mmCIF file of C-alpha atoms and ligand atoms in Angstrom:
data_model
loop_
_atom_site.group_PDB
_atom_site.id
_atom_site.type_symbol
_atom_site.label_atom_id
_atom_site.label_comp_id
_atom_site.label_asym_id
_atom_site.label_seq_id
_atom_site.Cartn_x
_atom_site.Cartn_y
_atom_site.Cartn_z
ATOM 1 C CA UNK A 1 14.136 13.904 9.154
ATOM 2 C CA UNK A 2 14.146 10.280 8.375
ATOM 3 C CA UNK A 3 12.459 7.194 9.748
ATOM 4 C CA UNK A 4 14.246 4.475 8.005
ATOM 5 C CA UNK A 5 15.768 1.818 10.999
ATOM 6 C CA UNK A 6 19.173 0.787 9.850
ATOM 7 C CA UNK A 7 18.957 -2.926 9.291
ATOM 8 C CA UNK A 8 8.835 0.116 25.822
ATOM 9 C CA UNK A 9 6.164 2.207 24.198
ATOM 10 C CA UNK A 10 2.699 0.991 23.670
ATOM 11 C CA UNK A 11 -0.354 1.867 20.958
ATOM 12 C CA UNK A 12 -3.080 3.100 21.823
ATOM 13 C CA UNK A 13 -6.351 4.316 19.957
ATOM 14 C CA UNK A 14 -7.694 7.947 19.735
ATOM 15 C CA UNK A 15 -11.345 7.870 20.459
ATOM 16 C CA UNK A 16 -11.887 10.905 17.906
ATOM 17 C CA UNK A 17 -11.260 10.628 14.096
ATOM 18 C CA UNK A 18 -12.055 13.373 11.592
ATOM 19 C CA UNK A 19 -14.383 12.742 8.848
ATOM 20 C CA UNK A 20 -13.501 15.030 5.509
ATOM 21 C CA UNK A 21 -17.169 15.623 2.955
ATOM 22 C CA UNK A 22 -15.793 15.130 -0.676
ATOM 23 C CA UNK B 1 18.422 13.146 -16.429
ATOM 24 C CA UNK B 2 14.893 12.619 -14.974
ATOM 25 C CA UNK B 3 13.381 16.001 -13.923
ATOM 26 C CA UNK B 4 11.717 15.035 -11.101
ATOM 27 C CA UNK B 5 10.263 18.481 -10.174
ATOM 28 C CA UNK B 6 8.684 18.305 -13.716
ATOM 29 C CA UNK B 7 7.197 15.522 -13.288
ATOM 30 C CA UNK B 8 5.681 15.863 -10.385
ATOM 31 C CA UNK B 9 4.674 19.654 -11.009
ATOM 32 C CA UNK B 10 2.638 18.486 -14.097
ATOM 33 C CA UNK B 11 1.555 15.368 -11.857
ATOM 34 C CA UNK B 12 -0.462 17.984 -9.496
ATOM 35 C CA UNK B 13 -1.243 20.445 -11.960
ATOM 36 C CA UNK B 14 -4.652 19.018 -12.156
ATOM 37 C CA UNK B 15 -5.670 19.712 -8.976
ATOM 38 C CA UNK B 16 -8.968 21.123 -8.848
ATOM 39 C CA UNK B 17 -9.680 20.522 -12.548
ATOM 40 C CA UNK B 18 -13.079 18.386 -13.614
ATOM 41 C CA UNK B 19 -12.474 14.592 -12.216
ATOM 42 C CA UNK B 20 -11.262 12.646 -15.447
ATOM 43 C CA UNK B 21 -8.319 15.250 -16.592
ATOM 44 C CA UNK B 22 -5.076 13.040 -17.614
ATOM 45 C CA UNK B 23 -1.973 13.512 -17.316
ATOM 46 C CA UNK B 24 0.325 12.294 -20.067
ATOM 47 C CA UNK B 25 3.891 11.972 -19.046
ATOM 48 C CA UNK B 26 6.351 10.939 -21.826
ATOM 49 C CA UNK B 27 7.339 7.285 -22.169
ATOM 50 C CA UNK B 28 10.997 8.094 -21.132
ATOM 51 C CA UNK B 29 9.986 10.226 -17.908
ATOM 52 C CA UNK B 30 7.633 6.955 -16.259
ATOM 53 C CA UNK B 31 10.513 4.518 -17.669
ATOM 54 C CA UNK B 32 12.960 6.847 -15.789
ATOM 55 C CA UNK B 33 10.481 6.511 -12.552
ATOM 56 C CA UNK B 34 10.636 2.741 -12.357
ATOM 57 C CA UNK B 35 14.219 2.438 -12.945
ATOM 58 C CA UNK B 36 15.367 4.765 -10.422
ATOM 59 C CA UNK B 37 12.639 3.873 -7.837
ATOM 60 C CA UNK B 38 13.886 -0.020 -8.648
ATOM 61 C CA UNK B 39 17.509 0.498 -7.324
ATOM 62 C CA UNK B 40 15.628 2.646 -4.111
ATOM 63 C CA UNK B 41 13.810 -0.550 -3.671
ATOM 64 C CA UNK B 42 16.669 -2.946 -3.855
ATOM 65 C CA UNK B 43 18.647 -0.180 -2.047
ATOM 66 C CA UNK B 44 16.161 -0.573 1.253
ATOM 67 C CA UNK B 45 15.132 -4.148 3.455
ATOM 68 C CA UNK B 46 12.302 -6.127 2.355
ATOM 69 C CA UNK B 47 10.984 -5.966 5.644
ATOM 70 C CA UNK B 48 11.058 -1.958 6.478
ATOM 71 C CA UNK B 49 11.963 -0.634 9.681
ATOM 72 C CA UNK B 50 9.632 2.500 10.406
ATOM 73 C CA UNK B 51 9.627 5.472 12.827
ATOM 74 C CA UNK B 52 6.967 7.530 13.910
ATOM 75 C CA UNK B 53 5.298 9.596 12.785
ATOM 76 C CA UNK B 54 3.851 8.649 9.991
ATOM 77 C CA UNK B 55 0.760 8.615 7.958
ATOM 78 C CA UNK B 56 -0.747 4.600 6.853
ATOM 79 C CA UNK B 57 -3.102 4.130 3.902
ATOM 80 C CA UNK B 58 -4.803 1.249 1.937
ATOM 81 C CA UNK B 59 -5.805 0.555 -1.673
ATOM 82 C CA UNK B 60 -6.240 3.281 -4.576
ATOM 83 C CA UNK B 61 -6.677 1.149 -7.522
ATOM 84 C CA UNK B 62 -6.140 4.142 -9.962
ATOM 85 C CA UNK B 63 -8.590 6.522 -8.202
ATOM 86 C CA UNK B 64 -6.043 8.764 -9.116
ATOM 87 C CA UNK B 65 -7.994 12.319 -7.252
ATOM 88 C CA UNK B 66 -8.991 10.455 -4.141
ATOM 89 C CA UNK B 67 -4.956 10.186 -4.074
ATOM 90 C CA UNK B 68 -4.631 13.662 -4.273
ATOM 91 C CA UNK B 69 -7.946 14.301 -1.611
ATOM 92 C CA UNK B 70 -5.706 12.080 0.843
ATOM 93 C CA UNK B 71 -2.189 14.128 0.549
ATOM 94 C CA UNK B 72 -4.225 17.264 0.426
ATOM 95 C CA UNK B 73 -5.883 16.462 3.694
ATOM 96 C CA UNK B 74 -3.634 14.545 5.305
ATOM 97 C CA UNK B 75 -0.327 16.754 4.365
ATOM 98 C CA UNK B 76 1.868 16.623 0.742
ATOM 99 C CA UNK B 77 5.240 15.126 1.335
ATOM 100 C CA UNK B 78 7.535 15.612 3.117
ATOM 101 C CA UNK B 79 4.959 18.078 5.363
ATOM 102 C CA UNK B 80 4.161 14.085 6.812
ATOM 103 C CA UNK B 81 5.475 10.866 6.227
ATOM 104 C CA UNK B 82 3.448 7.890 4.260
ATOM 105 C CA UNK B 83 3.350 4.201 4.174
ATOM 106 C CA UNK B 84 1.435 2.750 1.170
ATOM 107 C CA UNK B 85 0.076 -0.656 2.016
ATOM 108 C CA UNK B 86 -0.500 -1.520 -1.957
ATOM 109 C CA UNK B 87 -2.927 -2.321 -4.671
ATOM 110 C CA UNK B 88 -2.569 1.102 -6.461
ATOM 111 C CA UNK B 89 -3.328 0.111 -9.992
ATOM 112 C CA UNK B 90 -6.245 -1.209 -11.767
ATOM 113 C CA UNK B 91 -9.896 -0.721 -11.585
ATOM 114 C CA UNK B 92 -9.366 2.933 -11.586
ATOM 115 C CA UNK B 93 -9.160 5.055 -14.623
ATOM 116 C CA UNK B 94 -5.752 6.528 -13.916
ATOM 117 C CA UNK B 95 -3.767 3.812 -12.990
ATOM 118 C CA UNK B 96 -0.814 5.297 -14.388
ATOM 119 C CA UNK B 97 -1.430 8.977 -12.898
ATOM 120 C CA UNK B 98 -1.414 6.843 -9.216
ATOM 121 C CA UNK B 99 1.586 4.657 -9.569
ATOM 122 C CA UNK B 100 3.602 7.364 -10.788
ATOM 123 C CA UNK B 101 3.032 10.153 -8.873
ATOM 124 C CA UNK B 102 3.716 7.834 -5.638
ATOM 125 C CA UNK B 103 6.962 6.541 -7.120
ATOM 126 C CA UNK B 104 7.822 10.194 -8.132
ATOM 127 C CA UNK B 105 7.397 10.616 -3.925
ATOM 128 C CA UNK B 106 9.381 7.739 -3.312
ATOM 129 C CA UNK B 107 12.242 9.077 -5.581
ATOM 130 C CA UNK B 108 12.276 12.516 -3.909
ATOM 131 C CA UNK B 109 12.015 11.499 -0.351
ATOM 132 C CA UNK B 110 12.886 8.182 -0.032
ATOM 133 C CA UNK B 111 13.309 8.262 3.800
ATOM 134 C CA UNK B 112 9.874 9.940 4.733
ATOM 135 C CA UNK B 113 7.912 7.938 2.055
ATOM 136 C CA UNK B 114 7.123 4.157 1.744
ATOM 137 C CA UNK B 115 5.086 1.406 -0.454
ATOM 138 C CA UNK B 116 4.624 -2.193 0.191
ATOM 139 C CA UNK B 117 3.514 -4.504 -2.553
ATOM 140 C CA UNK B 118 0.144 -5.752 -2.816
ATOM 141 C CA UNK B 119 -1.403 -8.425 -4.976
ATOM 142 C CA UNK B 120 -2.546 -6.181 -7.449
ATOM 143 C CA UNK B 121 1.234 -5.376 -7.922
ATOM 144 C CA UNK B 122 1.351 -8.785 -10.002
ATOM 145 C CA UNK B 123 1.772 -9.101 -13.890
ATOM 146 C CA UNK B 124 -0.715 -11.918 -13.818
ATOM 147 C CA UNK B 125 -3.189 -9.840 -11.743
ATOM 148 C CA UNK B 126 -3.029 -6.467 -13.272
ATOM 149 C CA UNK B 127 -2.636 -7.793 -17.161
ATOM 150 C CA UNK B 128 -6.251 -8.619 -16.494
ATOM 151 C CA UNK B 129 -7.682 -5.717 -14.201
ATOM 152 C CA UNK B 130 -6.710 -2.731 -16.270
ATOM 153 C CA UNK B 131 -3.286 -1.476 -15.456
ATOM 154 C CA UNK B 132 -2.224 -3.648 -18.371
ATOM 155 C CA UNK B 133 -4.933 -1.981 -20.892
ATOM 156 C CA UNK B 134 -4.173 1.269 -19.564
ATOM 157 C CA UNK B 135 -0.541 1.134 -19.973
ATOM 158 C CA UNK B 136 -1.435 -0.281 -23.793
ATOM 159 C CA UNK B 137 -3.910 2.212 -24.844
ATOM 160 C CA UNK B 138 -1.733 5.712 -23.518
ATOM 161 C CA UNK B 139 1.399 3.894 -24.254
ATOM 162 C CA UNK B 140 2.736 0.326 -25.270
ATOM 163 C CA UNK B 141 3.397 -3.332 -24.021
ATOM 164 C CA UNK B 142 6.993 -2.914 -23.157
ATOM 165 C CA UNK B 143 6.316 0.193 -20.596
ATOM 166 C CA UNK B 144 4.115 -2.457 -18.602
ATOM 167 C CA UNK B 145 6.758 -5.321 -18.327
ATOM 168 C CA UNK B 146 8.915 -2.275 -17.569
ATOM 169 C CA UNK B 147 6.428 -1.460 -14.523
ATOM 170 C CA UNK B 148 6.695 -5.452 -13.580
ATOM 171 C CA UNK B 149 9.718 -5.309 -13.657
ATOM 172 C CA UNK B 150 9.457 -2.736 -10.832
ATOM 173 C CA UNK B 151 7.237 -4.189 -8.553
ATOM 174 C CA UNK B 152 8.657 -7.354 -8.729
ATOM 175 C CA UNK B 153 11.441 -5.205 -6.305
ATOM 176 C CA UNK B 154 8.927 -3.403 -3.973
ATOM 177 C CA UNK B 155 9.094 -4.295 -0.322
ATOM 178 C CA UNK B 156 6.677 -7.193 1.121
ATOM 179 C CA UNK B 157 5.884 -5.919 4.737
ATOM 180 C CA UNK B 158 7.004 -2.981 7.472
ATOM 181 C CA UNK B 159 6.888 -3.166 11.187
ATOM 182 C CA UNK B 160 6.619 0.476 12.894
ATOM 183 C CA UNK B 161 8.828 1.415 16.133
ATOM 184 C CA UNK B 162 8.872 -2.386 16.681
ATOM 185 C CA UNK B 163 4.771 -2.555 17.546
ATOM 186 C CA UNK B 164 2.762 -2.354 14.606
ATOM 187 C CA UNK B 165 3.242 -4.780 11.762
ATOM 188 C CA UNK B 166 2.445 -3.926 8.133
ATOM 189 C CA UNK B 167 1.463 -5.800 5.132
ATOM 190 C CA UNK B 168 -1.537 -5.821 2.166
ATOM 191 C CA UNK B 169 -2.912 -9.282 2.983
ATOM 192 C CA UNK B 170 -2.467 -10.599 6.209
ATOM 193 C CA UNK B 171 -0.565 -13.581 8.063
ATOM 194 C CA UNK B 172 0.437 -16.961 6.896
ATOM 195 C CA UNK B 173 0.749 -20.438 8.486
ATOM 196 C CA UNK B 174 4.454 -20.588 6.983
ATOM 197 C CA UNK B 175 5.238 -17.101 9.279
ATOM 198 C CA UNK B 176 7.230 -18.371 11.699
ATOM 199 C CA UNK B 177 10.420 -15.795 12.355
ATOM 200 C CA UNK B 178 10.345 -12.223 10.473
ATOM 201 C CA UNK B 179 13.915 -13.453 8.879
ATOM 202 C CA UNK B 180 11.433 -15.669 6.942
ATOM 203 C CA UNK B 181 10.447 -12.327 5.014
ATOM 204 C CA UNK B 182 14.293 -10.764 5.098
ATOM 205 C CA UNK B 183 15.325 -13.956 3.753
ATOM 206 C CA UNK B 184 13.136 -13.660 0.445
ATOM 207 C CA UNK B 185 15.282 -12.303 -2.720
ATOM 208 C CA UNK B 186 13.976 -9.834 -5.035
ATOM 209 C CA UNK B 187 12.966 -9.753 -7.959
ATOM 210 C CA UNK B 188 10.682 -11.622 -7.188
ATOM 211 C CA UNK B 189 6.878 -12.502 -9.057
ATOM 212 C CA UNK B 190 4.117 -13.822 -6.448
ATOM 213 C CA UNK B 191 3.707 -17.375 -6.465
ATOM 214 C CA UNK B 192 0.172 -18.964 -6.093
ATOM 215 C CA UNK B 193 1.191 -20.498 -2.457
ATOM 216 C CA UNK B 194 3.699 -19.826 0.484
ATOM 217 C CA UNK B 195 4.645 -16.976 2.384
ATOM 218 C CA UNK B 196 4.952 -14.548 -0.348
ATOM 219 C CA UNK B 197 1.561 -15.182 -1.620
ATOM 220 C CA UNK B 198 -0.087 -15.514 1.878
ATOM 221 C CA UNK B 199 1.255 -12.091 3.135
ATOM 222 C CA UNK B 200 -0.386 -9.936 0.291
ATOM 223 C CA UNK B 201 -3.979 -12.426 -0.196
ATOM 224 C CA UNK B 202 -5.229 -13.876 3.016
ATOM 225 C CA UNK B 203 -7.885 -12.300 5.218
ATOM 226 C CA UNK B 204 -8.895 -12.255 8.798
ATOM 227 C CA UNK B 205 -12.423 -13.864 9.512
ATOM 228 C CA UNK B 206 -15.040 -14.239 12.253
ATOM 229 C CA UNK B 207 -16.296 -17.306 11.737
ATOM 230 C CA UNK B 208 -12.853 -19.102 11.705
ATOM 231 C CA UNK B 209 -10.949 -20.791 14.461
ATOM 232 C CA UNK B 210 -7.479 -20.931 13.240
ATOM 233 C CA UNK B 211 -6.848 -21.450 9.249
ATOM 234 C CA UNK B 212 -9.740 -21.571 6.706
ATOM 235 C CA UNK B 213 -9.918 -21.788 3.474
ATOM 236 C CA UNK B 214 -10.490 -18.301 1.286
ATOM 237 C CA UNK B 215 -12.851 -17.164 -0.873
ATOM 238 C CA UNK B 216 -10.925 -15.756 -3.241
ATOM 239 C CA UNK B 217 -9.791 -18.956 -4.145
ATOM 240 C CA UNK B 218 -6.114 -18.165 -3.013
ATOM 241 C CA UNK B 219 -4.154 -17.945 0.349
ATOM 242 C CA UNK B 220 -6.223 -18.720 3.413
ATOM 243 C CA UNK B 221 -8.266 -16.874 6.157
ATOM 244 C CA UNK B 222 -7.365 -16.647 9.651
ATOM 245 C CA UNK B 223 -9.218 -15.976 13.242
ATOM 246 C CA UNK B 224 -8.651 -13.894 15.792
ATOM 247 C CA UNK B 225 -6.936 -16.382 18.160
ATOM 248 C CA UNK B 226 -4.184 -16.389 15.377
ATOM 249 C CA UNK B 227 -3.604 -13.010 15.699
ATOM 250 C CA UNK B 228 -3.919 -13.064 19.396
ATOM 251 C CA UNK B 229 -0.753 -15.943 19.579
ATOM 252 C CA UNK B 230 0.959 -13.550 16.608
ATOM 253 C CA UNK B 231 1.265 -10.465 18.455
ATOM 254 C CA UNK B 232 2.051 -12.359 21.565
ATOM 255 C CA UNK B 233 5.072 -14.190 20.474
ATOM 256 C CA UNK B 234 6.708 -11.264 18.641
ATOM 257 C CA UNK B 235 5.699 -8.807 21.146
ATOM 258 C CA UNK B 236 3.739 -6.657 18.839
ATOM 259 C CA UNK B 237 0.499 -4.856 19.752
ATOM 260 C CA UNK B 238 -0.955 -4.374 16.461
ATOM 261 C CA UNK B 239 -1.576 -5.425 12.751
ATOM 262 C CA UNK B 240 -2.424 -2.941 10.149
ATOM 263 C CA UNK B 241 -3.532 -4.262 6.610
ATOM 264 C CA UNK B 242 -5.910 -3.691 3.631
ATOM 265 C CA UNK B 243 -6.686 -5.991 1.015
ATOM 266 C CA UNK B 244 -10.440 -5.619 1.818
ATOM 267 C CA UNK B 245 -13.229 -2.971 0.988
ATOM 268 C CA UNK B 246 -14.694 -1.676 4.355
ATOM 269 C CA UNK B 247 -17.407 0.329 4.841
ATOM 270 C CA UNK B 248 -16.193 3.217 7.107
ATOM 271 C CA UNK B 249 -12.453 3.039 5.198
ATOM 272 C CA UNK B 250 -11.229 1.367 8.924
ATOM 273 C CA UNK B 251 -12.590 -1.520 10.739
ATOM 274 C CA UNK B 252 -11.107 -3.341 13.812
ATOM 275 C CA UNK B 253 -10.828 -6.819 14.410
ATOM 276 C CA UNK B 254 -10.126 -8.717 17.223
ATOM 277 C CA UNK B 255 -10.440 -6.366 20.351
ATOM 278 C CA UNK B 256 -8.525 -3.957 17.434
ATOM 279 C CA UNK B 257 -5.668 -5.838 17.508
ATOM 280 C CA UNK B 258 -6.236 -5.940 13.717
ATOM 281 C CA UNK B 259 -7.086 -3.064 11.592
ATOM 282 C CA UNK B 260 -7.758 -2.970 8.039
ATOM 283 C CA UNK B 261 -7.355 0.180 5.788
ATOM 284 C CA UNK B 262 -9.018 1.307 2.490
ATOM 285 C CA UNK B 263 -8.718 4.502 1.417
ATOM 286 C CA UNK B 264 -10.565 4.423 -2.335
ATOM 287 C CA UNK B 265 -13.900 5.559 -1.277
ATOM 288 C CA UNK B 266 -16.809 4.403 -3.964
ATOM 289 C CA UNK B 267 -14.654 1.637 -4.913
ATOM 290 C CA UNK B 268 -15.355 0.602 -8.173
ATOM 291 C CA UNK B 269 -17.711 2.737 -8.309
ATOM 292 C CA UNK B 270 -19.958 0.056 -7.133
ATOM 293 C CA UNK B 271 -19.911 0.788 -3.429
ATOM 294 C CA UNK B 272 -20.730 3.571 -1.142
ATOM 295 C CA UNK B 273 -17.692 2.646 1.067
ATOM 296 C CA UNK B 274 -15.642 5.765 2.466
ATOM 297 C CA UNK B 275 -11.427 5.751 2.307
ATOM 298 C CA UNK B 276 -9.754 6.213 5.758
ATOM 299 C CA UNK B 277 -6.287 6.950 6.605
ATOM 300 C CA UNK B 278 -4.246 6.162 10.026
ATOM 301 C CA UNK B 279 -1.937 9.027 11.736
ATOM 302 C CA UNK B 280 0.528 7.162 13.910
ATOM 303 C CA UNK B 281 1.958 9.829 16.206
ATOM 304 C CA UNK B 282 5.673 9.272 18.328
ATOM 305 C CA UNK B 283 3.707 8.126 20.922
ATOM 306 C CA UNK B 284 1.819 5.396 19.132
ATOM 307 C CA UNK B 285 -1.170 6.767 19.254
ATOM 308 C CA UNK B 286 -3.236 6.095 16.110
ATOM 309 C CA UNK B 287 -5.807 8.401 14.584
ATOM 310 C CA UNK B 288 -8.003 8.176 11.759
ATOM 311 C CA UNK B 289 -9.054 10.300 9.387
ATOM 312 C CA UNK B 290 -12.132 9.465 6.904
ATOM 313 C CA UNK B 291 -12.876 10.539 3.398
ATOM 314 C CA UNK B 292 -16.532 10.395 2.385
ATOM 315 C CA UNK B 293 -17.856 10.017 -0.924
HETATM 316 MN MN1 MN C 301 -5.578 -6.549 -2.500
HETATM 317 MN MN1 MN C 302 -7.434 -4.255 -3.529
#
């Protein structure tokens, strides 16, 4: 499915992030 | 022509292997890969338009398997959909592994996968950081005016459901109206001055109220009361950028209405930085998701 625009919502931060060893 | 399933098959056929293993695609193939991924360029805005989701990283510089550690955690196209903020060659080893594996994406799925240009994506930048002496030691000089010739094409910035604004560097004191960005023609090289050069070189700062002068000795920095009247007046809640190393691969600025990404952990091999990478969900929710070295 595409999410290219051809040429009310806000953001918001999740307070958890995941942290891969490498 | 171009067998694109090749390419990229032999591309992550050294997963796993001992970090350092090449791989050498033929002259024609990578010349094929900026040629087609040129007209894709032209094809799409200057100034994307993105949906959610998506996934948002920062600088690779040729850390070619800390690419692959990022699509392997974070989902191999089109399983999620990516937005490159830029600098992907030089400084690395496998500049050319990098570049061409992400423009190999951008062939395939060229709605679900993105790159902007960053300042690294500059013949007079990377002729001197190592893309240049890469692309002359594994191949010759023409395949690397062939790759300018490429990025001179690549789109400069990206806002995301109309919110989130995207671009390497940050903001610029000639940014007035976004159809100062849609009105730039490409190709195009990056100047030393203006909007062009501002939007993939300047950085945010603490200890600036307004415009400074940068250290880099191009572009300018900016505070946070910039950024404050710049998401105000174009009704936009946040900026993401890279440009700079940071420490946990993320790092907010301004009350996080400014964050900057980096996702080449051990930069340089210098640092003990970590790479992060931002999930943006449909409901604008933004996650991130670290790599440590
Ligand atoms: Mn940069
Ligand atoms: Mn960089």
């Amino acid at each position: 499915s595409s999410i290219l625009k051809p040429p009310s919502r806000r953001v918001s931060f999740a307070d958890t992030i995941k942290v891969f060893q490498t | 022509s171009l067998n694109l399933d090749s390419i990229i098959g032999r591309l992550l056929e050294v997963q796993g292997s001992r970090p350092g293993k090449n791989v050498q695609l033929t002259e024609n193939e990578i010349r094929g890969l900026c040629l087609k991924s040129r007209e894709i360029f032209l094809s799409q805005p200057i100034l994307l338009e993105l949906e959610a989701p998506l996934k948002i990283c920062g600088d690779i510089h040729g850390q070619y398997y800390d690419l692959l550690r990022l699509f392997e955690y974070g989902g191999f196209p089109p399983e999620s959909n990516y937005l490159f903020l830029g600098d992907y060659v030089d400084r690395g080893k496998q500049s050319l592994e990098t570049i061409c594996l992400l423009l190999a994406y951008k062939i395939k799925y060229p709605e679900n996968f993105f790159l902007l240009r960053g300042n690294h994506e500059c013949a007079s930048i990377n002729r001197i950081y190592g893309f240049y002496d890469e692309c002359k030691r594994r191949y010759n000089i023409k395949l690397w005016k062939t790759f300018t010739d490429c990025f001179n094409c690549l789109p400069i910035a990206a806002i995301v459901d109309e919110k989130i604004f995207c671009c390497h560097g940050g903001l610029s004191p000639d940014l007035q109206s976004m159809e100062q960005i849609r009105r730039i023609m490409r190709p195009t090289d990056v100047p030393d001055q203006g909007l062009l050069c501002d939007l993939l070189w300047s950085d945010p700062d603490k200890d600036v109220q307004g415009w400074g002068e940068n250290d880099r000795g191009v572009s300018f920095t900016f505070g946070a009361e910039v950024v404050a009247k710049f998401l105000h007046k174009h009704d936009l809640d946040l900026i993401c950028r890279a440009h700079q190393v940071v420490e946990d691969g993320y790092e907010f600025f301004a009350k996080r209405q400014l964050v900057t990404l980096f996702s080449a952990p051990n930069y340089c091999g210098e640092f003990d930085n970590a790479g992060a990478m931002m999930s943006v969900d449909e409901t604008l929710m933004c996650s991130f998701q670290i790599l440590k070295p």
